[PDB]
Design a protein around this ligand. Structure first.
Ligand SMILES: O=C(O)CCC(=O)C(=O)O
Ligand SMILES: [Mn+2]
Length: 294
């Protein structure tokens, strides 16, 4: 009986507020940093075209056994089309209904049941951490060769184009792509150097997020230590974060505030410094994310 955490803030900026992302994120900070994550819906007329080269898009996704931790105590290469056919067939077969008729709350409850289920073993695939320099960004970009339409030049130059976010930390990186299917997931983690993260869902079924404000980060880590497997106890956080899957209700019952959201196609998710987050994909989708500073 999974209990959905409360919803994180959703913002719908005006065209005036949408001109500068860093300025806008700095304005919503008093609320959003208290929830860890937030969702941003661009103006409805803001519709960037999908600019990846679909034909030559080939990848070998990683395999994910949902209950791999609870179990402690054949490989395929795809195109985008063939991955979507596999993904929709899996979800359609699993729930015995068309993929868009499956309620997000049902996939959510079934996902967390499967993670803790030793009785039935479900295995999915995730085209995660695909570099945009080997594959091309989902956003249109100007590089002198590879070449764009007049109507999409505004999106190649927009500040909300993830290729235009500031990434150089200050002292004395390109976006990553994520091809998801139903139940493909990412576990609890923060960004390197506690940086911001922003994620854009180009198309497909929603991506479900869970977020924890930065002030509760040490409390989550303490809950992790006490309940994570004893073999992974002494591991440094960079490695422990590879297998820190935990039901959000477990965190909530220990006093850790958790917020959720369904990131739909065309929407941004922003994670704030040291805001722990995790999630799963409701179905076949395509996301793009980058770490940005200030
Ligand atoms: O979509 C994913 O699998 C991970 C995304 C993420 O970690 C981020 O956008 O910060
Ligand atoms: Mn992240």
């Amino acid at each position: 009986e999974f209990v959905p955490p409360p919803e994180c803030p959703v913002f719908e900026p005006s065209w005036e507020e949408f001109t500068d992302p860093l300025s806008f994120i700095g304005r919503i900070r008093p609320l959003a940093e208290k929830t860890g994550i937030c969702k941003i819906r661009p103006p409805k007329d803001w519709q960037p075209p999908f600019a990846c080269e679909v034909k030559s898009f080939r990848f070998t996704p990683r395999v994910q056994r949902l209950n791999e931790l609870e179990a402690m105590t054949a490989v395929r290469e795809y195109t985008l089309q063939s991955f979507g056919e596999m993904a929709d067939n899996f979800k359609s077969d699993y729930f015995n209904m068309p993929v868009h008729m499956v309620p997000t709350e049902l996939v959510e409850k079934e996902f967390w049941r499967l993670v803790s289920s030793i009785e039935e073993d479900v295995i999915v695939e995730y085209g995660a951490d695909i570099s945009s320099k080997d594959f091309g960004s989902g956003f249109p970009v100007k590089d002198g060769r590879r070449k764009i339409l007049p109507e999409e030049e505004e999106y190649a130059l927009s500040g909300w184009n993830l290729n235009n976010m500031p990434v150089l930390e200050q002292s004395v990186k390109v976006p990553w792509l994520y091809v998801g299917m139903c139940f493909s997931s990412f576990c609890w983690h923060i960004e390197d150097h506690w940086s911001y993260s922003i994620n854009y869902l180009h198309w497909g079924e929603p991506k479900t997020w869970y977020g924890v404000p930065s002030h509760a980060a040490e409390q989550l880590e303490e809950v992790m230590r006490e309940l994570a497997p004893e073999l992974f106890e002494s591991q440094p956080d960079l490695l422990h974060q590879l297998v820190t899957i935990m039901n959000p209700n477990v965190l909530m019952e220990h006093g850790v505030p958790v917020y959720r959201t369904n990131q739909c196609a065309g929407e941004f998710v922003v994670t704030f410094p040291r805001a722990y987050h995790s999630g799963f994909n409701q179905g076949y989708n395509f996301a793009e994310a980058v770490n940005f500073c200030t």
